[PDB]
From Swiss-Prot:
Autophosphorylated. Binding of FGF family members together with heparan sulfate proteoglycan or heparin promotes receptor dimerization and autophosphorylation on several tyrosine residues. Autophosphorylation occurs in trans between the two FGFR molecules present in the dimer. N-glycosylated in the endoplasmic reticulum. The N-glycan chains undergo further maturation to an Endo H-resistant form in the Golgi apparatus. Residues 4-97 form the Ig-like C2-type domain. Monomer. Homodimer after ligand binding. Interacts predominantly with FGF1 and FGF2, but can also interact with FGF3, FGF4, FGF6, FGF7, FGF8, FGF9, FGF10, FGF17, FGF18 and FGF22 (in vitro). Ligand specificity is determined by tissue-specific expression of isoforms, and differences in the third Ig-like domain are crucial for ligand specificity. Isoform 1 has high affinity for FGF1 and FGF2, but low affinity for FGF7. Isoform 3 has high affinity for FGF1 and FGF7, and has much higher affinity for FGF7 than isoform 1 (in vitro). The second and third Ig-like domains directly interact with fibroblast growth factors (FGF) and heparan sulfate proteoglycans. Alternative splicing events affecting the third Ig-like domain are crucial for ligand selectivity. This is Fibroblast growth factor receptor 2. Belongs to the protein kinase superfamily. Tyr protein kinase family. Fibroblast growth factor receptor subfamily. Coiled coil: none annotated. It comes from the Eukaryota. Residues 11-28 are annotated as: Heparin-binding. It is found in: Cell membrane; Golgi apparatus; Cytoplasmic vesicle.
Amino acid sequence: KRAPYWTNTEKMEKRLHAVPAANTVKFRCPAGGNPMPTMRWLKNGKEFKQEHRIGGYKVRNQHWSLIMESVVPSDKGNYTCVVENEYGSINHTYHLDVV
């Protein structure tokens, strides 16, 4: 029926985030599509794995979100959600700065 598309762009408008260390960070890319699109996250363009940071990370598919607790300076970088189904692939990038 259709390619992925962003449901709420208002949540995604702010691209640059400066947060104090120890804070929790949440990035979201609310999407729609049929079939239901999958979501994956990239850090600086590379597959972002649990082992890539001490606290790992949580993904809540129903909220199209990525969550990192107790952030540290090492967490600085680009975070890109990639949303895809049979009829297309779209992406969006946040930048995280820890202070």
